[PDB]
Design a protein around this ligand. Sequence first.
Ligand SMILES: [Cl-]
Ligand SMILES: [Cl-]
Lengths: 118, 86, 88
Amino acid sequence: SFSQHARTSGRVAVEEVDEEGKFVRLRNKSNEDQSMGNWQIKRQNGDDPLLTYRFPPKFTLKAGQVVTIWAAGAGATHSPPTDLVWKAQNTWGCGNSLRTALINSTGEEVAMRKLVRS
Amino acid sequence: SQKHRDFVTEPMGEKPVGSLAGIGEVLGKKLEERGFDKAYVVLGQFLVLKKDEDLFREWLKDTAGANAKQSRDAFGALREWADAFL
Amino acid sequence: TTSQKHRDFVTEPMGEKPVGSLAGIGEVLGKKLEERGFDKAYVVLGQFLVLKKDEDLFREWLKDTAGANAKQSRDAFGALREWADAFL
Ligand SMILES: [Cl-]
Ligand SMILES: [Cl-]
């Protein structure tokens, strides 16, 4: 259904993007902890307005750990550091092109996963 | 092709020119002789030509003797890769 | 001393950005690059990549094609080397 295109320039990867828009999953693929306070996930679905999730001001993703950022409508609970809920947003969005990018607190794109419909 | 999927799904980095779809052994060595040894060098040529299909495929046919299928597959892999990572 | 143009360029994919978005590419240098088919930043990335990321060849190409000075060529090269190391 969708072809996957991913890039990781630092410690944390955009490991999985739910095709149905329930969540985005990140993994610290390094042997060091990553501070991600005020980091963002930019989500561009086709030409629809950009959605941007903002991590809490203090958040550490430990070495080797996963964090799933759930949309509020997926029926998930806010249980850190493994699961965060995007309070404002009930879906990550649908479309033919779904681009999820991890950004540091200063606007640097450090990782992405893009799903393009076949 | 299996090569096309392996190429368009991730950054190309220092991959050899042979990792690009359409680039067989003969076409790859003739590209390597002309200074197109890594896949990023052919991406570079594709980008200098403003991603134009006719100019890129004609360049691949004239520079290293690619056939129509090889040129189409290399152009398609580079176009898809650039649309995701550039 | 990295310019605000350098910082905005190396931190994200260049996409369809104009050649002027690249560090070192001022208004005169940009117009001269546009006039010779180097209209978008990705076209200059392309030239940088055809030259195998070589500093001396890229910088002398930029001077011979669009009249860049040493500073402009150094800043353009530095922005493309950093961008390629993160996104390529
Ligand atoms: Cl054809
Ligand atoms: Cl500058």
